Amino acid sequence: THSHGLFKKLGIPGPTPLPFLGNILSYHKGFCMFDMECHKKYGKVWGFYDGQQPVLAITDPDMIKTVLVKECYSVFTNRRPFGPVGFMKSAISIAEDEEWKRLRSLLSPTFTSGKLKEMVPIIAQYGDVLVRNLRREAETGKPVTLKDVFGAYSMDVITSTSFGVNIDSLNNPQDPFVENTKKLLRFDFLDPFFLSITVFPFLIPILEVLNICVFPREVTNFLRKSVKRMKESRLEDVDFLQLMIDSQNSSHKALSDLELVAQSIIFIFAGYETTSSVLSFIMYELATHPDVQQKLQEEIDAVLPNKAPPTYDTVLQMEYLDMVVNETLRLFPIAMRLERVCKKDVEINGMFIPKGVVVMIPSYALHRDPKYWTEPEKFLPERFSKKNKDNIDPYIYTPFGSGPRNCIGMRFALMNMKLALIRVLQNFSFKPCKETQIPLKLSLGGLLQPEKPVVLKVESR
Amino acid sequence: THSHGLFKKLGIPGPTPLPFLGNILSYHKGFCMFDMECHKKYGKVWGFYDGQQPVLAITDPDMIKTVLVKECYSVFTNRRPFGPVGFMKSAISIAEDEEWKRLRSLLSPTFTSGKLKEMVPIIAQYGDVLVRNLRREAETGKPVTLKDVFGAYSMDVITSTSFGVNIDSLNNPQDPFVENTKKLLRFDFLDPFFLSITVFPFLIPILEVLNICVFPREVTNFLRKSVKRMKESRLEDVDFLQLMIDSQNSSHKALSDLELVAQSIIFIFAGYETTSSVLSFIMYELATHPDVQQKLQEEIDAVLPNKAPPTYDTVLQMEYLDMVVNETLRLFPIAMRLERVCKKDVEINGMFIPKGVVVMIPSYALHRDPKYWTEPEKFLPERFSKKNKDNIDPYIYTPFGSGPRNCIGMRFALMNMKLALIRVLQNFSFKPCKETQIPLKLSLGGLLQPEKPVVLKVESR
Amino acid sequence: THSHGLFKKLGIPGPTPLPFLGNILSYHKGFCMFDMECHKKYGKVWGFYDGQQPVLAITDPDMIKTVLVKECYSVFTNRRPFGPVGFMKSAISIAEDEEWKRLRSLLSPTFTSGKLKEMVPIIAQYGDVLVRNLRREAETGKPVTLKDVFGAYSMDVITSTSFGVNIDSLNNPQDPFVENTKKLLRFDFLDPFFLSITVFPFLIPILEVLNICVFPREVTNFLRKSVKRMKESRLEDVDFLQLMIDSQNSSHKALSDLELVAQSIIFIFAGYETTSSVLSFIMYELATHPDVQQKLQEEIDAVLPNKAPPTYDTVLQMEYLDMVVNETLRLFPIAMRLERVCKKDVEINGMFIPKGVVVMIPSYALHRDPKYWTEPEKFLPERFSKKNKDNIDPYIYTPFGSGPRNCIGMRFALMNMKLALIRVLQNFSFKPCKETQIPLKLSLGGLLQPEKPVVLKVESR
Amino acid sequence: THSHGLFKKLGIPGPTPLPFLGNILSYHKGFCMFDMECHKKYGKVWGFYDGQQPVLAITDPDMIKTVLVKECYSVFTNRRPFGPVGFMKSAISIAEDEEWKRLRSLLSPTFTSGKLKEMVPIIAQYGDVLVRNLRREAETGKPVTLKDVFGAYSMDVITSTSFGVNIDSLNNPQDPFVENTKKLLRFDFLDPFFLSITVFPFLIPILEVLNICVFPREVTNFLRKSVKRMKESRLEDVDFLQLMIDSQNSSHKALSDLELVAQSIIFIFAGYETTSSVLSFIMYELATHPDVQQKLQEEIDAVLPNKAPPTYDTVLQMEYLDMVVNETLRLFPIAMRLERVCKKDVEINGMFIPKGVVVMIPSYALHRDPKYWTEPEKFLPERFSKKNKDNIDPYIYTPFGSGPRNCIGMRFALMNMKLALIRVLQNFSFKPCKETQIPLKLSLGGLLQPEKPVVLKVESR
Numbered sequence A, B, C, D: 001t002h003s004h005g006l007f008k009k010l011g012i013p014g015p016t017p018l019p020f021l022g023n024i025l026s027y028h029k030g031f032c033m034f035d036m037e038c039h040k041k042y043g044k045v046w047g048f049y050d051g052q053q054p055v056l057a058i059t060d061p062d063m064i065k066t067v068l069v070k071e072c073y074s075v076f077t078n079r080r081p082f083g084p085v086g087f088m089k090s091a092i093s094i095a096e097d098e099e100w101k102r103l104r105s106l107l108s109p110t111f112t113s114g115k116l117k118e119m120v121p122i123i124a125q126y127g128d129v130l131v132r133n134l135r136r137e138a139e140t141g142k143p144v145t146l147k148d149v150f151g152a153y154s155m156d157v158i159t160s161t162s163f164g165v166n167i168d169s170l171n172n173p174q175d176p177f178v179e180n181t182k183k184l185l186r187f188d189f190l191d192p193f194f195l196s197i198t199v200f201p202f203l204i205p206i207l208e209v210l211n212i213c214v215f216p217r218e219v220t221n222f223l224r225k226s227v228k229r230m231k232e233s234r235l236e237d238v239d240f241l242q243l244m245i246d247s248q249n250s251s252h253k254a255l256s257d258l259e260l261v262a263q264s265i266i267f268i269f270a271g272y273e274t275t276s277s278v279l280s281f282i283m284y285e286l287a288t289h290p291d292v293q294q295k296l297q298e299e300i301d302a303v304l305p306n307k308a309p310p311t312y313d314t315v316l317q318m319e320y321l322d323m324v325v326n327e328t329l330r331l332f333p334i335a336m337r338l339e340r341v342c343k344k345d346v347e348i349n350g351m352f353i354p355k356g357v358v359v360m361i362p363s364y365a366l367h368r369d370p371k372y373w374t375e376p377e378k379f380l381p382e383r384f385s386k387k388n389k390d391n392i393d394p395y396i397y398t399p400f401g402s403g404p405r406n407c408i409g410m411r412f413a414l415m416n417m418k419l420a421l422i423r424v425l426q427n428f429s430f431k432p433c434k435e436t437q438i439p440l441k442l443s444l445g446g447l448l449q450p451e452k453p454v455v456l457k458v459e460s461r
């Protein structure tokens, strides 16, 4: 009813869809569990329906590369719509085709290594802020909740690198600026609202015409004016805003004032919970594998003796650091899937893909596939040693996606976390508590996030 | 298209409706302006369409009494639906027919004079809090914004009379409890969202099935658990909650746990912005009529010499106080209209009213009708002197409605404000500022509220 | 999601509902099969969900009588809404509460035995027409399709008893009047359109505002003017129209012109396919039980020798006729279920029934319950002999419902069929063909109708 | 609300839009009147809103050519969506981009002059049928209704040229095949249904998921099987079907079975009412200008003496015929407007056109613009004399559109009408009646069609 006949025709296997719901009832255990099970039951490819919407999973690295890289421009340029977005229609991660291509161009030079290297001293300052607060909770032997302290850090780093605003959000939890921003939390695509959207995507236009937006009308309205104040306070009298302001001082067609705001917002949304979540997954791994934590602290003390301040260059110097981070991202690729809409009838690597189908790469499951990874469930940073790193297919390991539409904030994200990890590990050790969920259970929900929030003992070195 | 033919048939006059919109474009100057104009152009009765929905305005006191009192139970029992309400369907002001009749019964004894007289010492304590904060801004000769300081007061009084929670919300603007509650602001029925609802009332069910609610899912979810904590902290170990808890210790059928929560919420919503708004309109009048302010302070010093603490009995003693308050409510009846749905074909005072029509009383306009009020625009408390008070028809002056479905918090509202006014006027005088909007312009929007927020000098007596 | 918790709470058993769909996937084998299975699996009562909509099945005769008779006015007055109906909102079978009560009053005297006895000679004339056409197909030994020849008859009888229009619809299949009317076919509540309505009842208002109607806008528009012609051709210069016209020559409030049209339409819809279907089920039984057919012809020849024309009085004289008809209706009660909406919280025969629930009586299943009927599947007219007829509970056998809201055209329906059967059986015998589906399979769909259309040999006596 | 700000920004003039409705209330006098008025009030370009949807009218021949010809492929490839179309999504006139380009390719060779020249003897046979029936009404001096007799002809020609089915639809008005087909009438885009679609285009997806289709589910379902019978009766044992069947005996990708059906349907819909309407407008002109009618009959008798049967070659021989036809099409271009959706930000002839805008050419108004046409309202075939025909801009006179997406059935349409006109005028003269609407008033509605149906005396030569 009525496109539920598609994959049966094409010869592609898959779970049988119920009328209207398609296969969504199978998300009761989460995106990730659904995806592993399918991959095991059905093989290298399979199909399922999010409501009426046909989704084609693929697991062949060649075929993955064709979608994400080769035929990105021609065919697989956009992601799937997901709900009423109002003006956030112009955010880069949401935009489509030529508007996207334009925005990606105007915004790429913002994420170069040159710009990033300038942003280092800023991101650093809040490392120290992170430490002082951590210590206050280490001196009072009270088990620490990672996401909050990391949240406050991620928040602190975002505010400063995007707008110049400098706040201790942990101690200023109630700053109007800190407030709005913390409501920019990841979207739970299996919460009642979005599941309804899936069964009733014909309801999205209805919601749009009522100016209802999955980005709360208020947080947005606060930042719009906030920016249009900053914009007009800097003008005239180092951050993403500035870089964007300088850019509309001319693809092409510049950057409109409202366009600029939407990017500003999408970066917060992109960097905030992600940076904080990943830092938590890492700290958890580091606490449940005390040797890894020790090795890392020794690597750090070697590169930066006397607890020397980390620098851009010293960060990229640290290899085990890079290993620890990568392996965590294998275990917890917070995007879970990559997706592209098929805009044309095509044939890639011998398979016909009809227009309109959503093509999906199941990153979580691929990251834990036995056929590529020895002891996949196990946390083993050595997989990423300069020795073994060559035996890792870049289209099986894709925490940041691949191709022209991969994570634009990748370099920034990695640099951010690593700066945090270094300054923190220079100072503290992190130990499980009786109350620490071991082994960490993943949310049965729609985000990659722990079933129970990570809590750990923190002692001063 | 298609019921736009109704009033033409019945012989009832009114503005010509555009297809789909009915007459709503005529709200560009606001509910109140629309209503005065119609009353003048069309007479004692008229009709118009909120979208497809037929609305019948009436201005005859007999006919008003039949609707609000005589035929309340039989015919005119409910108000008009207005949007997706989810579980707030059970709030008393929203409920219908027998469920309403039941809730009104379970909740009436809560608002008796006996209960109210017990609540006095509590409401008082925050009078003093109001004073201390006011003084801090009087000692620093900085023009004061009424709604905030009154808001904080209204908020303080609500929290304490409904849940026991005691907070200085002005100095604790960032208490989690103070936060959620301040988002319970009056609904702007001419904002884009609600106007859309009017043209598309067929969209309300759609929104309901998506669990979208005009009461933010979060504020509600916070209070639901907050109550279910309090409930289980008091149980077992003077406020509305308690009174409601004691009541479900048995109309009939008790009060369900979720029912109780919805009342709790609706009271905040009812009392919060209203109490604060009305106090602001009064203080404004008192500043732009310095003699009234002086007379009032003299009345107060006579009843409570040496600035004696006000009491339940001393409050009802004060007649000019009561006059000042009533006249303000004439000028600014914050409900603006009263409404009832016609549930049956009926004939009242010689007029046929078909099923489904919304019957509306235009209180604002009636409060300013020349044919009942000499110099209606003028602020003249003497209209309400025990001498003249008899010449005022109770179905022309209806700040609190009338009948079985009138404002349940009337006595409480009046007592609250008066306690505030007394303690404040015992201590301060209130003087216009250069920046004070004189004469106050009303919002062209959908709430009765000043175009520009009231700001006034405050000096210590 | 979200009322799917209802019956679990109340202690009422039933199939587990899927999110959104409720239990509708269980209609794949049809209303009737679903109902028998439930009754067997769950007992005397059970619950299920048509989408979100709670349905409570009941099988206790006392409890059935309370719903259909005792508390009809107070509680169980209306049927469930089913789709966009536009002006057909005023048809009696669709109307609600007091409007219904009014229409039932204005239209009841139309269906008295006195009026019916006047309509006899008319319904007769088309008996003879039925015979002549039948003979043309008996003389050409060509197997006859019952529903068509009966259809043409039912159609002929409707046209004449409701509007005076006299046509041989079988030989005039292409008369504009015959055309429109044949499109008034029973609604398939398990066809894609209505199932969608069930999952999305929030879409009915949307469809209404687009003037989309399950009664085709054209058939209706043709009859509206047709009537308003007839009305004004008779006025001024014996049928339902006339009876209705005389009635608005004055409950109360008369009958509006549009109200009259809607009744006219609903009668066609009620009588057309029903009369024709039932006549087919009977003729089928009579052919697969040749003795019953013989006995019946002998009863008929006894009462009306020399093939005397049947009369009102001679029809009610015939007992085996009445037996044959009743038993057929037991086996094929074309309504399948009876339903009432619960308009109030009530308790009937010891069970609480909350407001809003649909209360359903599963007539088909009850008609085939072992615990009341020996060899239920078997066609045995003797069950209805004046001897055994007393052992049949009127709230288990309900082909026409019961109570104030039972089939208004019952007497007419029975009289119509019997007149047909008599004139036909006076003349022909009816014999199975090689192509006759034996045993008749019921539609797995939403109407009570044969899987394969009944076809039988017809020979001249 | 919310795109109603577009043209104000761009500097493009136009009527002020009401909230939600845009400018649609201005269609009360019809598309054509609205368009002339705008062109006069606002100049060479202007804008208006069909609901939220921005429409840009243009009248410069260069700019028109860029849209219809130059940038057809790149930018202006599709027409505007208009409603729920279900499987008719695949009809060529409805399809988009590459699917359209494909269908246009597969179907073009069907409309060559070679194929058309083969179809001539067929279209002829029904000329004679047209004559015989006409004569029956000429011999009984009873004023004739053109559209019916022409309708029957158009219908007869369609059936035969597309499926081989040969019927006298005028005398067989009640052939099942003739029936379904006559319900394929032009869509009234100002009827209640489509206007609603315009204010609520967000309702189209809702309607689609309910399988509701502006092409009646039944007519379509009858033709689908009809074709799939014919298909399998011809296979195996000269018309469009055959030409299409031979084509899927292989752009590319052939023609699916369902694709073929949708074309079949769209041709009926395209040719039926159009051919019949245009023939009526011409016959009307010919009756209200008796000299033109005489000249034409003399031209015809010169080319085909003794009433010789017309042939493909003799038809193209006749110049005044071609003149008469063209001028009629100037006066009544039954498409009224041409439209293309702007799929990209572009700049054509110095004007920026943003993505999403509908670009509209107002053919009716252009055909009656004083600045190109002397006495535009007057019917003057000499405008099209081989002398003056050169002074006519092909992008001002566009009865069939222009460019890659122009009327594919143009040659066929012209040939059809002319064959009809010749055979008819060889035999009859056509004279106004007392009841003939002179001067013909156009429908204030949404189709180009006479306010009152054309009726004329017909006498035998």
Ligand code: HEM
Pocket: A092, A093, A094, A104, A266, A267, A270, A271, A274, A275, A278, A333, A334, A335, A338, A339, A398, A399, A400, A401, A402, A403, A404, A405, A406, A407, A408, A409, A410, A412, A413, A414
């Ligand atoms: C640990 C942190 C992060 C991870 C693991 C991550 C991962 C990803 C992934 C998997 C995608 C989808 C890529 C694809 O479709 O191939 C993505 C897209 C994107 N990410 Fe990140 N991300 C992170 C942090 C950030 C940060 C800090 C930013 C800050 C600017 C950012 C901005 C974006 C944007 C703008 C896109 C959409 C790119 C486009 O459509 O052109 N992300 N990210």
Ligand code: HEM
Pocket: B092, B093, B094, B104, B266, B267, B270, B271, B274, B275, B278, B333, B334, B335, B338, B339, B398, B399, B400, B401, B402, B403, B404, B405, B406, B407, B408, B409, B410, B412, B413, B414
């Ligand atoms: C200055 C303050 C207030 C004013 C001027 C005011 C006025 C009104 C008015 C005009 C109505 C509609 C009455 C009708 O339809 O006839 C109403 C209803 C209502 N009000 Fe108030 N109100 C005030 C404060 C409050 C407060 C403090 C409460 C606290 C409990 C409250 C609770 C309610 C409730 C529960 C209803 C609906 C009554 C029902 O439907 O049974 N109001 N109010």
Ligand code: HEM
Pocket: C092, C093, C094, C104, C266, C267, C270, C271, C274, C275, C278, C333, C334, C335, C338, C339, C398, C399, C400, C401, C402, C403, C404, C405, C406, C407, C408, C409, C410, C412, C413, C414
């Ligand atoms: C063999 C023929 C028929 C059968 C078995 C039948 C059965 C029924 C049944 C079971 C109901 C529902 C009763 C209930 O809810 O308790 C009903 C309602 C109704 N029937 Fe019939 N029916 C037949 C023929 C007719 C005819 C010929 C008419 C012509 C007037 C008619 C008019 C109606 C009307 C108007 C209602 C709704 C009554 C109300 O709501 O007041 N039916 N019928």
Ligand code: HEM
Pocket: D092, D093, D094, D104, D266, D267, D270, D271, D274, D275, D278, D333, D334, D335, D338, D339, D398, D399, D400, D401, D402, D403, D404, D405, D406, D407, D408, D409, D410, D412, D413, D414
């Ligand atoms: C007097 C008769 C006719 C007139 C005045 C007429 C006019 C038109 C016009 C103005 C268009 C729009 C062209 C554009 O957008 O530029 C059109 C499109 C079309 N017409 Fe006709 N037409 C007529 C008869 C027919 C007939 C007989 C057919 C039979 C096949 C036909 C098939 C089509 C098709 C298939 C399209 C869409 C073309 C495409 O999108 O590729 N029309 N017609």
Ligand SMILES: CC(C)N[C@@H](CSCCNC(=O)OC(C)(C)C)C(=O)NCc1cccnc1
Pocket: A079, A080, A082, A093, A094, A266, A269, A270, A271, A274, A334, A335, A336, A337, A338, A339, A407
């Ligand atoms: C649709 C938009 C609104 N959602 C995402 C799209 S980008 C990928 C992350 N989300 C994801 O899992 O979505 C799918 C399943 C890949 C389609 C967004 O705006 N992300 C900013 C961001 C988040 C996290 C890491 N980096 C950047």
